[PDB]
C-alpha cells in the first residue's frame, strides 16, 4: 500500500555539469540538478538515482566497465555509487571545488582537477565489501599556478594532459619511472586553455584555448622537442570557446561556443565538417560517444539536451526542460503520458517510461496555470494568466477552440465536465466562475455568490455537480445541469486553498489555510472527517528570514491535494519541503516525503548554520556576481520587487522548494509531484517488501512448487498470492496450461481477484506473451465480470492498466497485421500490367 520510492525525475533533462555517454554508447548520463538521470536510448527507458547531493552536481563520470559512477557537487563532495545495484558505496569530500573527474581507460585509476592540484586516486574494487576508507591515494601533482580547467587521459592510461587558467597546458606521467618521458609545459595561448588532447597515434598533442586558437604540437627537430608546428583559429566575431572534446579515432573536434553554436572540425586538417546553432544560450558541455557517431550537447540556461548524429545530420534526442516553472501536472487517463504547464506559456507532454517530451505547445502568451484532461482522454484543456482557456486536440495537435471572458480576466483554476461539453474557469480578481460551451465556444453563464476570489474547481465524475471553493471561507455546490439551478454553500473555518473530489462523487475534501483537510458529504452538506496537518508539514528557514522556522507561518498549509482512485488516501503538497500521504477513513499520516535535500534551494533546511551568520549578516546573502570572469554572469537584470512569473535572473533570490501540483497515477500505484527541480514520480514498482496476506504455517515457496508438480494449479496460484511474491506469482502464472485457465479463473476466490488483475496489467504491458495474457484476461472478465462491475473503485486502477495493454500494444499489433491482409488481397486480386 503505502510503500512509495523515488523512481525518476521528469521535466528536466540537463541542469549543469558534464554529460557522459556510457561505454557501450547506448545510455546517456545527464546531471539533473541535485541528482543523476540515466536515459537508455535504445530500450526507451530511464531512471534517476535515489542518492541525493546537498548541492548541484558539477562533474560526473562512469568507468569503462560500467560498474562504478562518481558524482561531485560544487563543494567537492563526492559520492561513489554502484551503477548496477544503484547503491552508494562511499562519500568523499575533496575540500575544494573539483572542476573535472575522469576514470582512466584502464579503470584502475581516476584523476581529479581540484583547483591547481591534480589528484590521482586508486579505484575501489566493486566486488570488495564497503570499508571505512575505500579510496587509496596514488599521487597529488602541483605544477599549475591557477585552477585546472580540464584533464585528459592517454589511451594507454599512462599520461594525463591538464589545462589550466595559466594560459598553459601541462603533461604528467602516471608512473614515476616515466616522468622523464612527459615533463613538459605547453605555452603560447592568449586565453584559458579549455582542452588538450592526444592524437590516436599519441605522437601529436592538440590544445584549444578560450580565445579560439588550436595549436598542433609535434616532437620535431628545430635536439628534438615539442613545438607548435601549425596554428588554427576559429574566427568567431565575439563568441568564446566554452567546451571542447576530441575523438582520436575519427579525428573529430567538437567545439561549443558561448553564442550557442557548435562546430565539428577534422584535425589536423582543420576542415569544418558542420556548423549548427542550438539557440542563443551558451553550449555548456559537449561529449562524444565511444564509436564517435553521437555527440551530446547541453545548455544550462534553458536546460537543453541535444544528442546529434553528425554522420546522418539527425537528432537522436532534442529536449528542453523546466526549472522553477511547472505550475501544474496532469496524467493521461491511461497513465502513459503526463502533461505539464509552465510559466513560459508552454504545455509539454512527457512520456513516463522514456522520460522525453513528445510534443510542445506555444499558443499561450503568459503563464499556464492549470491543465486538465477530458474523461474521454483525446481532448485537453488549459488556462493561463493571459486571460484565455484553450482546448487542445491531441490526435492532430490543434488548438481547436479558445475561450475568453468579456472583461479579460486572468484565470487560475479550471474544471471540465465529465461529458466534455461544459468548461468552467475561476479567477483571483473576478469572484465569479465563468462557464463556456465546448461545442459552441459561447459563454453560457457567470456563476455568482462568492464574496472572495475562487481558488479551485472540480466536477463530480458521476453526479456532474460543480464544487467551488474560495478565500471567502466557504464552499458552494452548484447544480448547473437540470431545469432548476441550485446552490448549497458550506462554511469553513478558514480560507480554502485546494479541493479534491471523490471518484464516487459523494464527498469532497478541502485543504484550508489552517493546515486542515476537511471532508464533507456533498448530498448532506455535513462534515464527515477532519485531518490535522500543521504539525506534519516540514517548512525550512530561508536565508533571508529574520524569524525561526517554528514561528514561521509562511507555509503550514497544503495548496494542492488529490484522492487516490480507490478513495482511501489523500496526497497533499504545498510551498513546503514535504509531501504528506494521509489515509482518509482513519485520518492518519501514512507517510511523509522530503521533496528536496538541495541546499541550493532556499527552503530545504529548518536550521541554518550559525557560522554563516556574521555582524554584516548571512554570508550567503552576499552577492558574488562581480567575482565572475565573464561579463554576462556579472550583469544583473533583476527587477527590484519581482516574486514570480519571470526568468530566474529576474528574481535575485534563491529558488524556493515548493510543490505546485500532485496527482495519483490512473493505472499504477504511483503519484507525481510537480516541484521546482522537476516532476518527481514516486512509485511502488520495485516491491522488495514482504507483505504477506493470510499466511499459514503450511504455506511456503517450496509447498507452492510441490502443488505445481502435482498439477494442483488453483491451490498453487492461491498459495502464491498468500505469499504475495512476484516471482512466485509469475512462476505459477506461466505454468498453468491453456486448457486449465478457464477452470482456474472461475474458481479464484473473490478476495484475490483484485490482486491477479493488478499483476496481469503490470506484467502484460512489458511481457512478450501477448496471446497468453489475453487468454487470461478473457477468462477473468467472463468469469468475474459482474463482480468487477459491483465494485468499480476497488478495481479502477487495475482495469485501466488492462485497457492500456489492450489498446496501446495489442491493438497496434493487429492494426499492423490487418493492413497486410488487405494490402495482400489488392496485389493478388488486382490486375497489374503495362
Amino acid at each position: 500500500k503505502s510503500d512509495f520510492k523515488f523512481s525518476n525525475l521528469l521535466g528536466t533533462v540537463y541542469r549543469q555539469g558534464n554529460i557522459t555517454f556510457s561505454d557501450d554508447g547506448k545510455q546517456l548520463l545527464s546531471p539533473v540538478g541535485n541528482r543523476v538521470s540515466v536515459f537508455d536510448l535504445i530500450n526507451n527507458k530511464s531512471f534517476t538515482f535515489e542518492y541525493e547531493h546537498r548541492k548541484n552536481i558539477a562533474a560526473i563520470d562512469l568507468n569503462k566497465q560500467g560498474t562504478l559512477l562518481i558524482s561531485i557537487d560544487e563543494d567537492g563532495r563526492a559520492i561513489l555509487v554502484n551503477f548496477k545495484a544503484r547503491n552508494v558505496l562511499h562519500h568523499f569530500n575533496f575540500k575544494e571545488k573539483c572542476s573535472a573527474v575522469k576514470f582512466s581507460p584502464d579503470g584502475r585509476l581516476f584523476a581529479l582537477a581540484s583547483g591547481r592540484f591534480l589528484q590521482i586516486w586508486k579505484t575501489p574494487d566493486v566486488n570488495k565489501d564497503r570499508q571505512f576508507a575505500p579510496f587509496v591515494r596514488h599521487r597529488v601533482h602541483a605544477g599549475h599556478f591557477q585552477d585546472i580547467t580540464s584533464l585528459t587521459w592517454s589511451q594507454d592510461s599512462r599520461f594525463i594532459l591538464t589545462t589550466s587558467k595559466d594560459l598553459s597546458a601541462k603533461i604528467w606521467s602516471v608512473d614515476s619511472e616515466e616522468k622523464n618521458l612527459a615533463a613538459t609545459t605547453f605555452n603560447g595561448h592568449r586565453d584559458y586553455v579549455m582542452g588538450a588532447f592526444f592524437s590516436h597515434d599519441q605522437e601529436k598533442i592538440y590544445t584549444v584555448s578560450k580565445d579560439g586558437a588550436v595549436f598542433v604540437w609535434e616532437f620535431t627537430k628545430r635536439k628534438y622537442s615539442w613545438r607548435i608546428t601549425k596554428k588554427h583559429f576559429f574566427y568567431a566575431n565575439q563568441a568564446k570557446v566554452k567546451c571542447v572534446t576530441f575523438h582520436p579515432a575519427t579525428r573529430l573536434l567538437a567545439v561549443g561556443f558561448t553564442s550557442g553554436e557548435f562546430r565539428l572540425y577534422d584535425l589536423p586538417d582543420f576542415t569544418l565538417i558542420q556548423q549548427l546553432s542550438m539557440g542563443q544560450n551558451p553550449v555548456n558541455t559537449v561529449s562524444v560517444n565511444q564509436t564517435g557517431e553521437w555527440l551530446a550537447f547541453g545548455s544550462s540556461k534553458l536546460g537543453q539536451l541535444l544528442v546529434y548524429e553528425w554522420q546522418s545530420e539527425s537528432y537522436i534526442l532534442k529536449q528542453q526542460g523546466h526549472f522553477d516553472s511547472t505550475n501544474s501536472l496532469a496524467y493521461s487517463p491511461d497513465g502513459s503520458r503526463v502533461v505539464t504547464a509552465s510559466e513560459d506559456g508552454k504545455i509539454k507532454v512527457w512520456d513516463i517510461t522514456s522520460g522525453f517530451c513528445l510534443a510542445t505547445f506555444e499558443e499561450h502568451t503568459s503563464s499556464v496555470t492549470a491543465v486538465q484532461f477530458a474523461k474521454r482522454g483525446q481532448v485537453m484543456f488549459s488556462s493561463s494568466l493571459d486571460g484565455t482557456v484553450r482546448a487542445w486536440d491531441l490526435i492532430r495537435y490543434r488548438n481547436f477552440r479558445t475561450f475568453t471572458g468579456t472583461e479579460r480576466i486572468q484565470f487560475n483554476c479550471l474544471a471540465v465536465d465529465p461529458s466534455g461539453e461544459v468548461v468552467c474557469a475561476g479567477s483571483l480578481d473576478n469572484f465569479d466562475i465563468h462557464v463556456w460551451s465546448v461545442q459552441t465556444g459561447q459563454l453560457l453563464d457567470a456563476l455568482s455568490g462568492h464574496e472572495g476570489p475562487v481558488s479551485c474547481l472540480s466536477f463530480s465524475q458521476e453526479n456532474s455537480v460543480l464544487a467551488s471553493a474560495s478565500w471567502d471561507k466557504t464552499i458552494r455546490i452548484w447544480s448547473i445541469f437540470g431545469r432548476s439551478q441550485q446552490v448549497e454553500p458550506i462554511e469553513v473555518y478558514s480560507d480554502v486553498l485546494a479541493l479534491s473530489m471523490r471518484p464516487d462523487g459523494k464527498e469532497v475534501a478541502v485543504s484550508t489555510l489552517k493546515g486542515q483537510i476537511s471532508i464533507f458529504n456533498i448530498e448532506d452538506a455535513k462534515q464527515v472527517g477532519n485531518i490535522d496537518c500543521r504539525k506534519d508539514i516540514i517548512s525550512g528557514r530561508f536565508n533571508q528570514d529574520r524569524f525561526t522556522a517554528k514561528n514561521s507561518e509562511r507555509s503550514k498549509f497544503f495548496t494542492t491535494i488529490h484522492y487516490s482512485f480507490d478513495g482511501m488516501a489523500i496526497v497533499a503538497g504545498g510551498n513546503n519541503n514535504s509531501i504528506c500521504l494521509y489515509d482518509v477513513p482513519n485520518e492518519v499520516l501514512l507517510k511523509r516525503f522530503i521533496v528536496s535535500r538541495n541546499m541550493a534551494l532556499n527552503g530545504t533546511l529548518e536550521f541554518l548554520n550559525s557560522k554563516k551568520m556574521t555582524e554584516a549578516g548571512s554570508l550567503d546573502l552576499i552577492d558574488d556576481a562581480g567575482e565572475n570572469s565573464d561579463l554576462e554572469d556579472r550583469i544583473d537584470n533583476s527587477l527590484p520587487g519581482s516574486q514570480r512569473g519571470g526568468d530566474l535572473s529576474t528574481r535575485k533570490m534563491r529558488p524556493e522548494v515548493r510543490v505546485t501540483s500532485v496527482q495519483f497515477s490512473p493505472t499504477a500505484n504511483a503519484f507525481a509531484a510537480a516541484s521546482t527541480e522537476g516532476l518527481l514520480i514516486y512509485s511502488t514498482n520495485d516491491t522488495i517488501l514482504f507483505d504477506p496476506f493470510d499466511l499459514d504455517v503450511d504455506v511456503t515457496p517450496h509447498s507452492t512448487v510441490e502443488a505445481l508438480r502435482e498439477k494442483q494449479f488453483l491451490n498453487a496460484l492461491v498459495m502464491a498470492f498468500r505469499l504475495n511474491e512476484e516471482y512466485l506469482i509469475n512462476k505459477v502464472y506461466e505454468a498453468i496450461p491453456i486448457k486449465e485457465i478457464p477452470l482456474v479463473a472461475s474458481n479464484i476466490p473473490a478476495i484475490y481477484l483484485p490482486r491477479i488483475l493488478k499483476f496481469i496489467g503490470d506484467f502484460a504491458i512489458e511481457s512478450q506473451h501477448i496471446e497468453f495474457n489475453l487468454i487470461w484476461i478473457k477468462a477473468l472478465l467472463s468469469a468475474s465480470g459482474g463482480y468487477i462491475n459491483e465494485h468499480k473503485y476497488l478495481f479502477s486502477t487495475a482495469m485501466r492498466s488492462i485497457q492500456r495493454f489492450i489498446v496501446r500494444v495489442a491493438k497496434e499489433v493487429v492494426n499492423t497485421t490487418t493492413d497486410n491482409k488487405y494490402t495482400y488481397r489488392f496485389l493478388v486480386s488486382t490486375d497489374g500490367s503495362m
Binding site: 569544418l272 549548427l276 506461466e734 467472463s782 465480470g785 494490402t823 493478388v828
Partner: protein
C-alpha cells in the same frame, strides 16, 4: 564465523582503551594516535576530528604506539607494524615468542623491548629510507644488570645511545656497538614512568610512591626531588612554551602542575579521569604550546589550556588555573541498549551501565553528543524531590523513539532498572524531557512503546497493567488490565487501530486501541520474553522461553512461522526493513539470520562475545550490534544490498561443529515461449515495430531546420577514412565469376548468402535469426536492396523465410513488420507480376499461415467490448 550477508565495518563510540596515546607533528600541526582494542585512530589536535583508522584489525591487541611524522608504529604480540595514513606499509616480525612491551624510534633505529628484557634493534637499509626494516642486533638486559624494563627513551644530542629505564635503575646502551656505556645508581623505590626533559642530559623518573626525580645522565646524579605522598605517578610531561612547568599525572585520576623555577604547585586538576579505569594513563604537553592533552581508560580524551596571566606585572606568579578546552568520549562500560534515531543512518541512540545516554553519529564522530539530564522546572510549581548531590539516572533497560513530532514535544520513552516510572527525552534538544510516566500499580516498568503519530506513550508494568500517557501533556489517558504477570512487549500498528501485548504469563492480547475492546487472546506454550512489531507488514515476532521465535500476523491472530535452532536464551532480535528477514542473537554466542518466506535459517555467525542487542538500519544498509565486552558498537554492512543472497537453509551440524536456483535467489525469468501454439512477441523494446514502419517520417523530423554550413573543400571519403568501432551495415567487408545483379560470389553480402543458403537447405532459421538482430536502418536497407528483377528468386525466398517465421509463432510482430516493408519497397514489382507462378505460390503459402493468425483479433475485440462495458456499466 564469516557471514554471507554481513561484514564488519568499524566500531562506534570508542576513542581510547587506556593504552597511552602517541602524539606526532606534521609541520606546525599536531595529531594524536589512540588505541582502540585491535585498531588505532588518529585525531587532529586542533579540532579532535577523526582523520584515519587502521585499515585492518591486528591479530592481537595493540600494546604500544609511537608516531613520528607521517609514519605510525603499532606493536602487537611479537610483531611491530608500520602504518602510514592507516594503511600498513611494512610489518616487523621479531624472532622470539616474547611479546613486545615498549617501543622507541630515534633516527634510523627502531628499538623494541620484549617482556623477557630483550631489546631488538632494527636499522634502515639505506640512510634515505623512510622507516627502519633491516635487523641490526639484539641487546638483552640481565637481572644482574637491572630489573624489568620500564620504558625505552632516547635523549637529544646522544649519538647512538638508548637510555633503557628499568625498575631498579637506568641503563645507557650504545645501539650501534651494543655495549653498556653507563649504569645508574640503584633507586630505593620502583620506577613507573620516565620522560625526557626539554633540558639536556636530564630525564624525569616517576616512582611508585609519589616521587619524581630529575636524574641527570651526564653527571649521573640526582638534581631534584618532588614528593607526592600516597600517590602513584602514571605520566609526566614538561611545558615547552617558555614556562618551566611540569605536569604529573596520577593513577588516582588527578593531574598536578608544578613550577620548577619557583618550587611551587600551580594547580591540581581533580578527578579528570576515573580511578577505577586507571586514572591519567597519559598526559602530554603539546610541543611549544600551553595545551595539554590527557587520556585515561574511561574511553575519554580531554584537552586543557593555560590562559595568559591577568596581572600586567608578575605574570609568572599569577598563573591562571588550567581550563577545559575540548574533549571526546564515549561509554565507560558496554552499552546496554541501542536504537536508530532516524529513518536515515545518521544518528544512533545508546545507553550503558555507566548510567549515561549517548547519541552517536555514524556519518561523523564529532557530531556524537551526550544528552543532558538537567531537569525542567515543574509545571505545578512545587519543589522537585531529589538528593542535592547530583547522580545520573539508573541504567536503561528499554527505549522507544519516534520522529513524527520531533521538535514539537517529547519523542523518546525510556525504562530504568528497579524504577516505577518511565522518563521522557527530547532528541531535538538532546535533553531529558519534562514528563514522567508512572505505572500506577506499584510495579516496575518492563516495556515502553510509542504510537507512530507520536502522541501516545505506552508503559508496561511488572504487575501486568498497561498505562497510556499523552506525550505532549504527560496526562494519563487509558489503562488496560489483562495480563496478571509482567508485560514484556507492547506495540501499536501504524494505523493506530489494533494494539498487541505480550507478557510472562504467555498470553498475547489483541486490543482495539480506538474502541478500547479486547479483539482476542492467544496463549503460547512458554513465557514470552520480547517483541518486535513490523508495522508495514503487520507481522510481529515473539521470543519465547523455549528458545523459539514465533511470528504472528496481527490481522488474523494466528501463528504463521515458528523458528527453532538456538541453544540458549535469545538476547535480542530485529526485523529487516523490508520485513523479509529476522536477525537474532542468543547466549550461545551466535547470530542467525532467518528467512521468513521459507521459515529457515539462511546465515549463521559465531561471535567471540555474546551480542546483547541487534538492530537493522531503516535503510537496511547497516546492522548494529553491541556485545557484553567492549564500550563501542559494532557496525556491519549488509552485503545483500549489493548482490543477491541464496536462501538455502544453513547446515545445522556443521554450524554446531564450528561452535531450483531461481527459487533460491527469489527470482524467476519468464519463458521464451509458453507454448508453440501461442503467439509471442519479440524479446525487445515495443517501439521497434513502430520505428520500422514509420522510419522515414521519424527521420525527417530529426533533420535540422536549417542546413548546416560545411567547408566546400571536404574529403569525399571522410566517413570511410577513419583511424583505428562502427558496426553499421555500411561498414561491412566481403567474405571469401559471372556478374550477378544481387551479388557476385566472393563479393556477396552476408545476408544474401544466408538467404541463398536457406533456399537450398529449405530452412531460413539462420536468416530469420540475423534479421531480428539487424538494426532498424539495417533491416530497411536489406529488404529494399532485395532483387526486384526476374525470375524474382530473392523476393520469393524472402517470402518463404517470413512464412516459416509465422509458423514458429515467435517474434511474429517483426515478421508482420518485415512483410509490410516488403510491400512498401516491392509492392509494384509483386503487383506487376502477380500472375507469375513462383510469386503467386509463395504469396499463397504466406496467406495460409497468415490467415490462421486472426484469433488474436477476436481476443482483442472481446476484451475491449467487455472491459469497456464492465468499467462503464
Amino acid at each position: 564465523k564469516n557471514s554471507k550477508i554481513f561484514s564488519p565495518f568499524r566500531i562506534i563510540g570508542n576513542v581510547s582503551n587506556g593504552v597511552p596515546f602517541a602524539t606526532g607533528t606534521l609541520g606546525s600541526t599536531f595529531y594524536i594516535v589512540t588505541c582502540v582494542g585491535k585498531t588505532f585512530q588518529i585525531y587532529d589536535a586542533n579540532t579532535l576530528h577523526l582523520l584515519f583508522v587502521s585499515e585492518k584489525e591486528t591479530p592481537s591487541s595493540i600494546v604500544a604506539l609511537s608516531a613520528h611524522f607521517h609514519y605510525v608504529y603499532a606493536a602487537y604480540e611479537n610483531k611491530v607494524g608500520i602504518y602510514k595514513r592507516g594503511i600498513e606499509e611494512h610489518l616487523l616480525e621479531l624472532e622470539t615468542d616474547a611479546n613486545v612491551e615498549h617501543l622507541c624510534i630515534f633516527g634510523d633505529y627502531l628499538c623494541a623491548s620484549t617482556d623477557d628484557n630483550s631489546i631488538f634493534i632494527y636499522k634502515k637499509s639505506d640512510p634515505q629510507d623512510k622507516y627502519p626494516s633491516e635487523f641490526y642486533t639484539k641487546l638483552t638486559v640481565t637481572e644482574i644488570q637491572g630489573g624489568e624494563i620500564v620504558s625505552l627513551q632516547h635523549l637529544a644530542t646522544y649519538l647512538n645511545k638508548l637510555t633503557v629505564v628499568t625498575k631498579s635503575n637506568v641503563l645507557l646502551f650504545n645501539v650501534r656497538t651494543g655495549k653498556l656505556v653507563f649504569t645508574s645508581n640503584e633507586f630505593p623505590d620502583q620506577i613507573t614512568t620516565a620522560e625526557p626533559a626539554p633540558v639536556l642530559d636530564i630525564i624525569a623518573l616517576g616512582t611508585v610512591t609519589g616521587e619524581v626525580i630529575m636524574f641527570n645522565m651526564r653527571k649521573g646524579k640526582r638534581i631534584r626531588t618532588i614528593k607526592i605522598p600516597q600517590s602513584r605517578i602514571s605520566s609526566l610531561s614538561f611545558r615547552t612554551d617558555g614556562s618551566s612547568h611540569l605536569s604529573v599525572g596520577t593513577s588516582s585520576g588527578d593531574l598536578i602542575f608544578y613550577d620548577l623555577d619557583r618550587r611551587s604547585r600551580i594547580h591540581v586538576l581533580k578527578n579528570i579521569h576515573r580511578e577505577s579505569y586507571g586514572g591519567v594513563t597519559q598526559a602530554t604537553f603539546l610541543n611549544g604550546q600551553p595545551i595539554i592533552v590527557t587520556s585515561g581508560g574511561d574511553n575519554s580524551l580531554k584537552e586543557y589550556v593555560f590562559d595568559p596571566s591577568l596581572s600586567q606585572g608578575s605574570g609568572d606568579v599569577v598563573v591562571q588555573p588550567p581550563r577545559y578546552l575540548r574533549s571526546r568520549g564515549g561509554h565507560s562500560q558496554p552499552p546496554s541498549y541501542i536504537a536508530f534515531a532516524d529513518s536515515q543512518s545518521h544518528f544512533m541512540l545508546s545507553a550503558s551501565k555507566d548510567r549515561s545516554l549517548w547519541s552517536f553519529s555514524l556519518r561523523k564522530d564529532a557530531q556524537s553528543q551526550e544528552m543532558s539530564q538537567r531537569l525542567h522546572k515543574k509545571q505545578d510549581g512545587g519543589r522537585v524531590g531529589g538528593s542535592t548531590i547530583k547522580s545520573k539516572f539508573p541504567e536503561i533497560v528499554a527505549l522507544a523513539i519516534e520522529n513524527a513530532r520531533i521538535g514539537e514535544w517529547e519523542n523518546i520513552i525510556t525504562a530504568h532498572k528497579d524504577e516505577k516510572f518511565a522518563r521522557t527525552w527530547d532528541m531535538r534538544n538532546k535533553r531529558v524531557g519534562r514528563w514522567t510516566f508512572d505505572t500506577t500499580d506499584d510495579g516496575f516498568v518492563k516495556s515502553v512503546a510509542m504510537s507512530q503519530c507520536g502522541n501516545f506513550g505506552f508503559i508496561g508494568s511488572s504487575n501486568g497493567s498497561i498505562t497510556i500517557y499523552n506525550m505532549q501533556s504527560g496526562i494519563l489517558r487509558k489503562k488496560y488490565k489483562l495480563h496478571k504477570r509482567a508485560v514484556t512487549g507492547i506495540s501499536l500498528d501504524g494505523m493506530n487501530r489494533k494494539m498487541v501485548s505480550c507478557g510472562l504469563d504467555g498470553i498475547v492480547g489483541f486490543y482495539d486501541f480506538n474502541k478500547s475492546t479486547l479483539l482476542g487472546k492467544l496463549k503460547l506454550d512458554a513465557p514470552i520474553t520480547a517483541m518486535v512489531y513490523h508495522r508495514s507488514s503487520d507481522l510481529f515476532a515473539l521470543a519465547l522461553d523455549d528458545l523459539s521465535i514465533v511470528v504472528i500476523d496481527a490481522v488474523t491472530q494466528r501463528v504463521v512461522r515458528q523458528l527453532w535452532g538456538h541453544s540458549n536464551r535469545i538476547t535480542a532480535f530485529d526485523f529487516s526493513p523490508e520485513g523479509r528477514w529476522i536477525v537474532s542473537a542468543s547466549l550461545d554466542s551466535t547470530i542467525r539470520t532467518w528467512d521468513l518466506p521459507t521459515g529457515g535459517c539462511i546465515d549463521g555467525i559465531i561471535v567471540d562475545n555474546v551480542a546483547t542487542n541487534v538492530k537493522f538500519s531503516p535503510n537496511g544498509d547497516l546492522l548494529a550490534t553491541t556485545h557484553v565486552t567492549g564500550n563501542g558498537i559494532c557496525i556491519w554492512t549488509n552485503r545483500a544490498q549489493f548482490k543477491t543472497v541464496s536462501t538455502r537453509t544453513i547446515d545445522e551440524s556443521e554450524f554446531a561443529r564450528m561452535a531450483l536456483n531461481d527459487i533460491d535467489f527469489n527470482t524467476y525469468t519468464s519463458l521464451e515461449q509458453i507454448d508453440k501454439e501461442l503467439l509471442t512477441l519479440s524479446i525487445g523494446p515495443r517501439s521497434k515495430m513502430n520505428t520500422l514502419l514509420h522510419l522515414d517520417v521519424i527521420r525527417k523530423r530529426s533533420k535540422p531546420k536549417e542546413a548546416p554550413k560545411k567547408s566546400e573543400k571536404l574529403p569525399f571519403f571522410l566517413q570511410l577514412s577513419g583511424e583505428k568501432v562502427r558496426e553499421g551495415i555500411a561498414h561491412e567487408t566481403p567474405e571469401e565469376n559471372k556478374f550477378k545483379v544481387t551479388g557476385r560470389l566472393g563479393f556477396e553480402s552476408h545476408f544474401t548468402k544466408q538467404l541463398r543458403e536457406g533456399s537450398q537447405s529449405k530452412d531460413y532459421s539462420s536468416l530469420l535469426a540475423t534479421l531480428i538482430n539487424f538494426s532498424p536502418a539495417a533491416v530497411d536497407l536489406e529488404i529494399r536492396s532485395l532483387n526486384s528483377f526476374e525470375p524474382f528468386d530473392e523476393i520469393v525466398w524472402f517470402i518463404d523465410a517470413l512464412t516459416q517465421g509465422l509458423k514458429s509463432n515467435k517474434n511474429f510482430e517483426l515478421y508482420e513488420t518485415f512483410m509490410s516493408l516488403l510491400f512498401k519497397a516491392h509492392g509494384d514489382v509483386i503487383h506487376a507480376n502477380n500472375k507469375n507462378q513462383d510469386i503467386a505460390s509463395a504469396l499463397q503459402n504466406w496467406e495460409d499461415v497468415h490467415k490462421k493468425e486472426d484469433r488474436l483479433d477476436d481476443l482483442v475485440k472481446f476484451c475491449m467490448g467487455v472491459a469497456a462495458f464492465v468499467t462503464t456499466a
